[PDB]
Amino acid sequence: ISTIQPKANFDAQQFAGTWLLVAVGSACRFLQEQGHRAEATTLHVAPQGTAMAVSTFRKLDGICWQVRQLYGDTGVLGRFLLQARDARGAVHVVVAETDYQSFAVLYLERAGQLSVKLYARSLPVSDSVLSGFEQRVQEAHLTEDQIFYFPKYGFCEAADQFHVLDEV
């Protein structure tokens, strides 16, 4: 893990409910090269007790796709592992900063890879939160070229029976 720590006394309960992905600062060139065509990503969250049920939804080519992932508890309040589903590896996710009624900042780290996400309960996000997240990006040593903003419309709750990836 990088020099990062969770939200103090993180509460899975209040963090529960829908979150909208605002922006992702990442070294992953996938957002760099063809960072356009990244759909408005919504993230329904529910306390799986210690774990969190985390259903990402997207419009993959306009197909509404739910991807249900367990953010499994690592054993530290506000840090999660996501099973290590496959050669995707373990993904160390930390809720670094949030107020549960408007915004949260999540850190996601993989071997040689760090990524930070800004989520908001509603859109637009406050400018103070925006610039705070941009500071978090500087503290992650990422550049402005490595911040990618996700469109504000076309959120797609309710993937059907079949467009549900259910990675677990």
């Binding site: 992953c28 996938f30 957002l31 997207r58 993959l60 796709w65 991807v67």
Partner: protein, 49 residues
């Protein structure tokens, strides 16, 4: 990134197959038939003297 994993792209054909073609087809044929008949015939005489 939501994307397609490139694993399993090819399979090795065992020697005992001259071909293994992997062509995908569906055919659906349906026939439904209904026939009903009734033939009702009341016939009567009544008489008195």
């Amino acid at each position: 990134r939501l994307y397609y994993g490139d694993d399993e792209k090819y399979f090795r054909k065992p020697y005992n197959f001259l071909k293994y073609h992997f062509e995908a087809l569906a055919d659906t044929g349906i026939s439904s038939e209904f026939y009903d008949n009734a033939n009702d015939l009341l016939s009567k005489v009544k008489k008195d003297k």
